[PDB]
């Protein structure tokens, strides 16, 4: 015979306190973005960008994660 | 015979405090970016990014995180 | 016969205390980029970056982690 | 004769820049005021004052003053 | 004859620039005020205060200031 008994037994915190967050400044591509072009030749695919983009500004109070996995795998 | 008793036990924190948080300048490409050209050839695939790009101010009041891995496998 | 008791038992505490968290100033490409190119061939893939990118202000209050695995295996 | 020619010229700039100003804390009397009186006697004016009296946060953001004064005398 | 000609000039700055201003914190009387009285006489006026009182926290941008005084006396 066989027996298995999966117990597993969690009490657990994952805890922050923060008197104040805050006066966050993010200014990006501030300056001049000058692009001059003459006489190109592209005979492939072309993807371009100019500028001020994807920029992230991430501000969460709490931010706090917990990822648990749990696997019994009986063969 | 054969029997397994899995029981693990957690009491367990991850815990911060922080008083205050704050006053954070995140300022990316302040200057000038000039590009010229003249004369190119391209044959292949051309990817191309010019200025302020995929910047980040990640400012979590917490930012605490706990990963938890369980695995039982019998053969 | 076999008796297998896993009890791992956790009373464990990842702590931070912090007055306060701040003043903090990331000025990344401050100054001036010139790319300049003439007569330039290229017969595979090109990837190009100009000016600031993927620049990074992490400020977690926290930011503490706890991993921890746990495998048990019979055969 | 008497000839009085006051022109005083003003071209006069008081300035401030502040990128932020934040996260000021001020908890004052934070702590246990136990007052205990027994048999006193009093024959003239009592003032009294207990707890957490005439506290002052001030946050100004310029904060900037200018004070001038004239005064033209004949006799 | 008397000619008196007050032409003060003035072409004058006071300035200031600051980048990033906080995480001030003032915590007073954090602790325990225990005022214990038995058997007093008073035959004048009395002024008592207890506790936390009169704390300031002062916290301008600029906080600059000019002060200017000009005065012509004729006798």
Chains 1, 2, 3, 4, 5 share one sequence.
Do not use: A
Request: aromatic share 4%.
């Amino acid at each position: 015979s066989v027996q298995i008994v999966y117990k597993p037994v969690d009490l657990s915190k994952v805890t922050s306190k923060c008197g104040s967050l805050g006066n966050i400044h993010h200014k990006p591509g501030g300056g001049q973005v000058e692009v001059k072009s003459e006489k190109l030749d592209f005979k492939d695919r072309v993807q371009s960008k100019i500028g001020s983009l994807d920029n992230i500004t991430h501000v969460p109070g709490g931010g706090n994660k917990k990822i648990e996995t749990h696997k019994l795998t009986f063969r």
